[PDB]
Structure 1
Amino acid sequence: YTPSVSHRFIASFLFNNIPSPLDIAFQRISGLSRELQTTQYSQGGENARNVWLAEKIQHGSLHLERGVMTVTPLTLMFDRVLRGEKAVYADVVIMLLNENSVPVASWTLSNALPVRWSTGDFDANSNAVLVNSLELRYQDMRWLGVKV
């Protein structure tokens, strides 16, 4: 029942089934969530119970944080999409590592679309690293591993 820490993790991006070896280090990755949307229904004479009806499933978005560094393939894809060029999908594999760099838990995302890139403020009174904030929207989620 021993739980897992949340400060050792890795992410990999595959572009046309080629993994990117320079895009695995991130300061922060947001949590992944799935929600089954439901609507509550009320009957005529049933005034003490509730009925919930299932609907389509909503996936969350992927948020990453990273400092300013040399241009990598992930940056070039993000620049191209936000430049006004043809949209391109990417596949992302997020892995949670143990003390032996073995992924105990892993989540795979299909057809991730880059949709937002923001950068931190230029502040003359600050002592901080300039950090890029990226957001992607994907079509499907699937988890593999011995833990979850």
Structure 2
Amino acid sequence: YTPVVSHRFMASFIFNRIPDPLDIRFQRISGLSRELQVTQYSEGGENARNNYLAEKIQHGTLTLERGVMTVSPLTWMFDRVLSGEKIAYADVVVMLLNENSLPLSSWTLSNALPVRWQTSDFDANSNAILVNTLELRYQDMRWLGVKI
């Protein structure tokens, strides 16, 4: 039918089956890619058409940046795991939104491990928002709804 636009979205986190509804305001989210790795096997007298053998599926890496805000249960989670205290998992629910703020489709990203966390640079010469480019690696992705 008709396509949808890419500037309404919210992403909520699930810290140990306890939802996190304070941290849904993000600047951008990376867009979710998955890829089936493929080993090409060429053989014998068949030298006019390829022959591709499937392999394991390689999921992408989810980056999402936000303006730096007051400290929140999202920020206490990344600071806990990137200071070497506790390696813990967090589930991410990324959903599109309608005009009536209803979800079109949602991606649930099970057991996403927070990998890196990077702020923007200070500079005195230009005016811009300090952002928090924080990037986390998920190990499964289960698309759910209508209008994928």
Normalization by structure 2: what TM-score? 0.98
* TM-superposed deviation, 1:21: 1.5
Comparing both structures, which one devotes a greater share of its residues to strand?
1
Moved over 2 A (4+): none
Tell me what 2:8 maps to: 8
SS in structure 2 opposite 1:77?
helix
The separation in 1 between residues aligned to 2:34 and 2:10, in whole angstroms, is: 21
Q: Are 1:59 and 2:59 matched, yes or no?
A: yes
Tell me what 1:116 maps to: 116
How many residues in Structure 1 have an aligned counterpart in Structure 2?
A: 148
Q: CA RMSD in A?
A: 0.7
Structure 2: segments with no counterpart, 5+ residues: none
1:43-66 deviations in Å (ceiling 9; x for gaps): 110010110000000000110111
User: Aligned letter for 2:141?
Assistant: M
* TM-superposed deviation, 1:25: 0.5
Normalization by structure 1: what TM-score? 0.98
Tell me what 1:17 maps to: 17
Structure 1: segments with no counterpart, 5+ residues: none
Tell me what 1:144 maps to: 144
Give percent identity, aligned residues only.
Answer: 82
Q: Are 1:101 and 2:101 matched, yes or no?
A: yes
User: Aligned letter for 2:139?
Assistant: Q
Tell me what 1:134 maps to: 134
User: Aligned letter for 2:60?
Assistant: G
The separation in 2 between residues aligned to 1:87 and 1:13, in whole angstroms, is: 16
